[PDB]
Structure formats: structure tokens, C-alpha cells
Amino acid sequence: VKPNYALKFTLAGHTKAVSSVKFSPNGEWLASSSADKLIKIWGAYDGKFEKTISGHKLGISDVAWSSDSNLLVSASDDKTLKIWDVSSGKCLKTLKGHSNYVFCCNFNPQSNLIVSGSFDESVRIWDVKTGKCLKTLPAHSDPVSAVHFNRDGSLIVSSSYDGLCRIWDTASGQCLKTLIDDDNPPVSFVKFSPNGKYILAATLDNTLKLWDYSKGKCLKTYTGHKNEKYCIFANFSVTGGKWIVSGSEDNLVYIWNLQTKEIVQKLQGHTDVVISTACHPTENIIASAALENDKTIKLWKSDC
Template identity: 60%
Template structure:
């Protein structure tokens, strides 16, 4: 035997996540607009153009309850930090706060003069920020159901709002292509981020450490901005996004987004490479969400499909 012969090669271990379909859930009758895991990950909330919110058990896939009350379609939902309340933003121009222990509406926030498109709680959940087709960003005192601030934020409908991890900053983006960073307390605009081509910006969120913002634009690109220096530091491409406001999110060292080619894309945050594409939906994937602790993601699709898919990482 040749002692210098190389050892037999071992099969290559796949790098990156290996998400596989765990459940496919159905219950909505019109396009699903938003998905959010509860802070402890035990529940998944979904909203849609059918005016309802559904609450699912993450681990069994069973529907727990259906929340009814909005008179027009719902575009976005957000959990309070303790998981006790859910806020919903609707085309009926209201934001409604639901008590999740009993499934009833406890407050209605009135003030937007057009469709409310996006909503987000601050970390202590005493404030909400919302944005809408009236081109404003509004900050609400949740307990008093009162608008504290109306920011004349953009010159087009506001598509997304996000608080940073300590609640001191708000990010907003709009169809005018601008991303703005606001001081949450004073309401002052601290930064405006704009790309040369100025595509419609459809979703924005702070990175977990709040040093960056992740912005999805309708030129089929997701950009990671260092907002302190106003520089785009990474771009993620491969998916299709030219028409709809599609969510993107962080999951550990990955970036996840829906796509208009009916797929879910997963990128390596650092290398910007597409490392997995999830197939199975039969229509545009608008909503994605990442489980707070477990290796799970959820995705949901529009009219021709109407399924919510829960994927778990087998790697």
C-alpha cells in the first residue's frame, strides 16, 4: 500500500442552512400581508387583505384564534414585547390593539387620514410608531390611545417603520425612495439615506445591534446601510422585487426575504451570497418572519396560493 496516498475524500458537508418545509397552513381567503412570531416564539400571527388576523401555534400548526374587527384589509401587525398585545394597521385608517389572552380588541388608535400601512412597538411597548398613505409617521402613547407626534416624514406613502433596540431611534421609508432616521423623543430627523437611483423603498428595519438598517427597494435589491456614515455597506440580490412591498428580516448571520418569483431567498449576511432558495409557494411571497430563538422561518403568499409555510433548519 502506498503510504503517501491521500486518504479517501470525505463527503463535503453542506455549508449554510438547510431549511425544509415543516407545515403548510391555510385559513386566509385573500392575500396574506404580514407574519410575526410572538416574542417567545410560541405563536405566529398572520394578517391579510381579508380583514382578519389569525393566531397559530408555532409548533403544532393549529389555528388558535381569529381576530375580527377591521372593516378593510390589514397591511401589518406587531407584537408588544411581553407578547400580551398585538397591534394591527389597516386600510380602514385605524390601528387596533388586541389583547392576546382573550382575543378581543382593547383600543382603536385614530388619526391617520388614509390607509395605515405599517406599525411597530418600541422595546418597552409603551409607544407605537405607524406610517401610512397620508405620508406621515405617527408616534402613539399606547396606554392613552393618543397620537404624541405627527412627523411630516415623506412626500409619498410611508411603507415601513422600525424602532431600534433601545427605542431611541425610528427608521422610516417610503415610496419617495428615502430612508429617514428620527430621534424618537424629539421627532427630529437625524439622517436621510438615499440611493443614487432612488428606487421605491418598501421595507426597513434596524439590525439587531442597531448599527445598521436593512432596506428593501423595488429594484430587486436589499441594502445594508451604515446610517451613521450614510454609506451602503452591503447589497443582496438574486430575488425579484419590482412591484410589491416585500418584507426582509435578519436570522442570525443570514438575511431572509420574500420574492415575486414565488420563492424565499436566504443570503449570508457577510459574504452576500444566496445560500438557500425555498420553493413551494405558488404566488408572490410578501411576508417572511424569523423565529426569535429556534431555527425556523415563516413565509406567506398572495392570492393564487394563500398558504403560510413554516420551515425549519435541518442542518
């Protein structure tokens, strides 16, 4: 069985490179961030523009939703994160502390915490209620490319251009494990699987790898795409068939069979690097976003 994703909507409106797209947990919305310093909110099923949220002084690298779909956090080149009320568009908190570009962000499942990673090589854990930094982790010796909580929020994984993925205890801020091999090329993205037992990591040698967290060993490698430069988002698609979904520097969305590692689809449409993909929480829907020569988001749907 293969999926049959087909283009349903093209979401135009950003005036510069799109940097991230994320579906709200309740499945109703898509948020996008851009080098044009804006966040846009769109209908998840029809691609209908809903609103623009503005306030950052420089480009935005990432956006992430709270578990109740009411708040957004954005990570900016202006060295700050902002927490937004989605329904009003108001900035509730500005999180200051990083000394350089903030590249990545995520809420924990309870959504009382935010984790951020920065060009300043640190990982920070922030209290949502107060906006206070709770912990600064001396995580890496190069820019932090991604940060992600596991399904119960007890662990954080961080990745970096230094080649390591590190798993941290959220409560204590101590490192529990480093995912490491004989050779360790730059890691451009990392995330836990939805079941919490595995980690997906992208390296800048055109490879994605699935690691067993318990054993600290690689189980599967996915190749065929191009990724030598950019921090490209990848995903587990779990609503229908079990796929790995990623963008690519050949401007395609790649879909692999999780178990066999075979490419099952390549989605064509974007006219620049597909920097971000996201998978809808309940329906077989993928969102893809592209850089400056394209500036669009595309929504794709499959029966499978």
C-alpha cells in the first residue's frame, strides 16, 4: 500500500521565505511563520486565510502550538520568543535571554513549559505563566537546530550542527543520553516519535535516521532526498499508513514507508526548497512550505 497525496490548496500571502508550518492539535488550523516577520493562521481543511499576527522585529524561524490550540510561541532572529493569544492575536509574553538568533521552539504536552534552542548553542526551558527562564542547558558546541519534548514531557531531545543529539531530563536538566556513532555529521533536525520510543534525526549528509532511544542505536535510514544545507523539518505520519515525511533541497516533499524505507511518493509543486512539512493530527493531510522563490504553503490530501 502506498499513499496518494494530491495537491488540494496553495496558500499564498507571505512576502518572503516561509520557515515553518504546524497544525493545531485540535486539527482546525495551520500556523505559518516567515522571514517576512509575520505569523499567519489558516484553516486546516480549506486553506482559508484567517489572520496575520505581527510584532517580531526580524524574521521568524519557528512557531509551535500549545496543547489546547489557544497559544502560539514563535522563535525569532530578534533573539526573543513571543507567546501569542491566537484568538486575539495579542503578544502575551516576550521571552528574553538568548544572546543570538532563536531557531526552534516547542511547548511541552501540559503546555506549562516552552523549550527553545538558539544559535547561541544553548537550550532553555521557560515557564509559560511567568515567562521566566527556568533553566539554561549548555547543550551543544554549535547552533541548536531542533528541540522537542517526548509524549509525556519528561524528556527533551536537542540536536545540533556539532553532530550530537542529546536527551535531557526535563525536571533536573541533566543529560541522560547522547546519540552517537563512530562518525557524527551535523544534525539539522530531531524529534521523538509519537509513541515516545524512537527518535528521528536528519543529518546534512542527505540522510534521515530512526534511532531506538532505549538502546541508543540506529534502526532505519531513509535516503533519496537532498539535504546538505538547511534545517528541514521531518515528521511521522500516523493517521493512515505509517510514513516518514520530509522536505528537500530538490523542492520535493518525500514520503517513505516507515518500515521498508522505500520512497512511496514525491510531491511536486514548490518552486524552491521545501523547508517545512507537517502532518495533520487526525486526517491524512500534509502541509508543505517553501523558501524565497516560492513563498507558498501547499496542503495535500490522501485516502491513505
